[PDB]
């Protein structure tokens, strides 16, 4: 997504110190951080968290680094689906296929040496943090921490 | 029963042994039965102690279908109306039945329900008016609470089955079998793993059923769980009951299944029915449980009825030596991924609220 | 002291698998890429027999050649094996009658009428035999059988038999076959006045692994009419024709035991061997310095064997060494010899392949037998129940119907060498 | 480098007859178990050295380094064999080196060290008929009165381990019949120590989790230990391990050291053998045995990060210290044969 480059600006513009960090160096940052916080793209029947691709990547870190985890989700983001793991989600484009290599073929910071757009879209887009890794949903309905009452609330939302 | 000084004897049964409190007393014969016992109840009481594989659901059904016969054959002592006296009659039927096998949770909750409808019954009716009513209520109970719920669970259960899966069951759950057979009838492409255990190898009959429908099945005893789980990708368990904390209460080997599954990253799915939920809770699998006679594992070998003896036939008279076999054990909720009730797929921790949905908005 | 011996009857069942016996005798053809007599041999080794005598009637040189070559010729062999030759189609009894005239039986002994697969320790039943013997010298033979289902796939019309045993002392007092032309069972009630608890059993499998006393060979010279061990002999005892003699059965209730006599057995037995049922006698034990190894779903590979990526292997399969396999091809429920090679984009299911066999590109096989050193061109096809012999070849773009056995000589069957059927006849 | 590339089968069968005899009894399970494999292994090698002709030690090294590679090819899983071999190899090179130095007093032939190697081999033999005695002593420093112990599957080493403490201290023990394979032996053990005055409770192999709630310690006797400290134990022992880890209940292992081997568990599917399914399903259910897939594993594996303490004929040691026994017991070259 690269949405981080925009997020810092929106904070920098609002008089807030920032420091963009690679996706590969979040663990190194947990020592400094006192509290992690992410948005939400979809809340599930089990209290799961469908958000951008790398949420569960750092959700375990905060879980392992003993720092708390909070996610903000509007009511109209509760979904009726129910996965089984960090993977059981319907996804349009098939993801993470391999190639078939037939026997017939051909500074410490090396910028611009990355994957191509074709290589990228093979990778997924969304992520899922099981509810044991979140310590508190932030909703217009309030803050929900049971991630079982989310179902009671989810049942309340639907018929 | 000399008296309830025999219950004081139970108060003495709180000694060093962890199982000191677990009740061993049974009556597996009709010797010196009381007079006020219905025949169709006797047959059930016999069916309890001697049947194996007695599914927790069928017992509730066979109990209710039997209960109707009791009331239908019941006649109140005239001058004293029905509601004032019916319970003690029935209360004298349970006290017999428990001496054949302790009440399942699937039965006790029904008992506490019918006893309720007895009290709330309108007095301004008559006998033939009253008894005919609750028979439908009983039938309604069987329609709504179990069969439909059963019919809903299976559909929602096989929904999350994916073509190419490898399913693992353990010790013949009529519900778990009921969903597996449905999966084949909708053309779901998969295969099943069947785990069995000592003593009464309840898993063979699950193999018998699934094979008679033609499913790639695999039979290994539980002491091979470390091996087989690598092939597995999903786990289905039908429970005896689910605890208000979210723990699953099923046959003795249920826990290790969920445990080994977690440490092998496979999901654990608890297909249980709402009426088998309980307000109580358990931290250890020993406080509330029921036993089976230790003699049943004296028979070493692959058979149970067959007179293949063992080295422990004298264990009853060998001090510092005792055989036992609990029938049920809890399973901590953090190992259960989903519970499949007729209210849909729920997290196991959401159980006690559902029980309140019955207590609330009803009476 | 140290007096124990055993005798095996090869060449007694050679006619059923005849389309290939011309190539190699039945005691030398492979089961799980391993000749049968070894399965029988290691079995006898379990019984601790010290002296083994083999009867032969076809390819006796080829038989003795392997034996003289075999592990059982070495000093490590726990028993000394000698071979004896005789006329073709060796009728039983005539074996023992020739045996007694040779005077070879020291004391009690065993016999199997062919090649058997089993892991049953005879030591207990042997003790069972010697025990009741020393009190009643008239006990001459005790038979070994396997408790099974009456419709068990390993139970065929041959072993399909009904026994009547004395549950107290385990003595067979009545025995009859299961010829579909017989509906009833008849017993002379004179036995009930001499017994108390008789158990009519149809759940059995006559492994034909019978333990006999030293009277038997002489008792076969006398009563020369007896030619079959079950038909003539047993009936003679039970009918009091041969008088005052008793027999018994050791109904085995664990481990595994069977013999190889029919196509509906070979395929069955093999699918039981790979199914571990006769542990330790398994491929992944490699008793003859093979290089096998177990893999899940009962697939058994050797070493130095090449498999294409697109080629996939399904359950219940076995691959010999030095055998190639083409691309995009699928093998399942199949047994393959060593040093073979498979074409590309082919399909094989529940077949049987031996050593040095080839397969052309894009071919369909299934539920058929391919003898050793057999060549098959591309684009061919073949259906169930088929049988070929060694050296037989079939040209490309071809097909072979059901149950059509082949050969390399018009002794009695059909087919020739090079091009398809309907070609090269005579 | 197997022996066939050095000697012919007949020559192997002639000069070293007990070898091929043992090889036969090995792949055929006529010999079985780790202990019985070890003792018979050295006795064979004893006669080998007692009946061999050679000159240099380097050639003698190449010989034993070959038969073992063949001997281990028989039934490799019973690592007890190879462990005895690598022990002898180091026992040679260090005995040679210690004798290569006395001769270098001021000289600045070289064989017939035979009986010493035999006397060195016999020292290994007499050491084995002793591990139990050497191990059953450390019990009194762990098992205390009223403690509750869980243990599966008739491990002889574990038996004498407890029976020792039960002579003086009184306490309880829970025994889970290692079904299906360790069934018979386990019941005997329970019956045996029952007479030793120790509260014995036989359970199904499945009620492990139910009682782990109130179990103090758990004790296990393995079949072998691998280079990463992993345990190759008899059937159905990962349950009790995982059951203990989930209950914070510590895990202890009472095993002789000969079962230790530096083979590294690359692929477990090449380690866990499979026995006959007769042990779990009768031959009679002919419909089933034809319609399904039956399997019976002989061994079980548990990773080292689940063990809390080892009990050896040398002493109690953590798994992280195991390696320093191997280098003090084996030589690195003899890892692969």
Swiss-Prot record, chain A:
Changing residue 26 to F: Decreases the amount of gcn3 in the eIF2B complex. It is found in: Cytoplasm, Cytosol. Changing residue 51 to Y: Decreases the amount of gcn3 in the eIF2B complex. Belongs to the eIF-2B alpha/beta/delta subunits family. Component of the translation initiation factor 2B (eIF2B) complex which is a heterodecamer of two sets of five different subunits: alpha, beta, gamma, delta and epsilon. Subunits alpha, beta and delta comprise a regulatory subcomplex and subunits epsilon and gamma comprise a catalytic subcomplex. Within the complex, the hexameric regulatory complex resides at the center, with the two heterodimeric catalytic subcomplexes bound on opposite sides. Acts as a component of the translation initiation factor 2B (eIF2B) complex, which catalyzes the exchange of GDP for GTP on the eukaryotic initiation factor 2 (eIF2) complex gamma subunit. Its guanine nucleotide exchange factor activity is repressed when bound to eIF2 complex phosphorylated on the alpha subunit, thereby limiting the amount of methionyl-initiator methionine tRNA available to the ribosome and consequently global translation is repressed. This is Translation initiation factor eIF2B subunit alpha. The chain holds residues 172 to 341 of 341 of the full protein.
From Swiss-Prot, chain B:
Keywords: Cytoplasm, Initiation factor, Phosphoprotein, Protein biosynthesis. One of its GO terms (molecular function) is guanyl-nucleotide exchange factor activity. GO terms for cellular component: cytosol; eukaryotic translation initiation factor 2B complex. GO terms for biological process: cytoplasmic translational initiation. The keyword Nucleus does not apply. It is found in: Cytoplasm, Cytosol. Component of the translation initiation factor 2B (eIF2B) complex which is a heterodecamer of two sets of five different subunits: alpha, beta, gamma, delta and epsilon. Subunits alpha, beta and delta comprise a regulatory subcomplex and subunits epsilon and gamma comprise a catalytic subcomplex. Within the complex, the hexameric regulatory complex resides at the center, with the two heterodimeric catalytic subcomplexes bound on opposite sides. Belongs to the eIF-2B alpha/beta/delta subunits family. This is Translation initiation factor eIF2B subunit delta. The gene is tif224.
Swiss-Prot record, chain C:
Its main location: cytoplasm. It is found in: Cytoplasm, Cytosol. The modification Phosphothreonine is found at residue 158. One of its GO terms (biological process) is cytoplasmic translational initiation. Keywords: Cytoplasm, Initiation factor, Phosphoprotein, Protein biosynthesis. GO terms for molecular function: guanyl-nucleotide exchange factor activity; translation initiation factor activity; translation initiation factor binding. GO terms for cellular component: cytosol; eukaryotic translation initiation factor 2B complex. Component of the translation initiation factor 2B (eIF2B) complex which is a heterodecamer of two sets of five different subunits: alpha, beta, gamma, delta and epsilon. Subunits alpha, beta and delta comprise a regulatory subcomplex and subunits epsilon and gamma comprise a catalytic subcomplex. Within the complex, the hexameric regulatory complex resides at the center, with the two heterodimeric catalytic subcomplexes bound on opposite sides. Acts as a component of the translation initiation factor 2B (eIF2B) complex, which catalyzes the exchange of GDP for GTP on the eukaryotic initiation factor 2 (eIF2) complex gamma subunit. Its guanine nucleotide exchange factor activity is repressed when bound to eIF2 complex phosphorylated on the alpha subunit, thereby limiting the amount of methionyl-initiator methionine tRNA available to the ribosome and consequently global translation is repressed. The chain holds residues 15 to 440 of 678 of the full protein.
UniProtKB/Swiss-Prot annotation, chain D:
Component of the translation initiation factor 2B (eIF2B) complex which is a heterodecamer of two sets of five different subunits: alpha, beta, gamma, delta and epsilon. Subunits alpha, beta and delta comprise a regulatory subcomplex and subunits epsilon and gamma comprise a catalytic subcomplex. Within the complex, the hexameric regulatory complex resides at the center, with the two heterodimeric catalytic subcomplexes bound on opposite sides. This is Translation initiation factor eIF2B subunit beta. Gene3D superfamilies: translation initiation factor eif-2b, domain 1, Translation initiation factor eif-2b, domain 2. Keywords: Cytoplasm, Initiation factor, Phosphoprotein, Protein biosynthesis, Translation regulation. One of its GO terms (biological process) is regulation of translation. GO terms for molecular function: guanyl-nucleotide exchange factor activity; translation initiation factor activity. The gene is tif222. Acts as a component of the translation initiation factor 2B (eIF2B) complex, which catalyzes the exchange of GDP for GTP on the eukaryotic initiation factor 2 (eIF2) complex gamma subunit. Its guanine nucleotide exchange factor activity is repressed when bound to eIF2 complex phosphorylated on the alpha subunit, thereby limiting the amount of methionyl-initiator methionine tRNA available to the ribosome and consequently global translation is repressed.
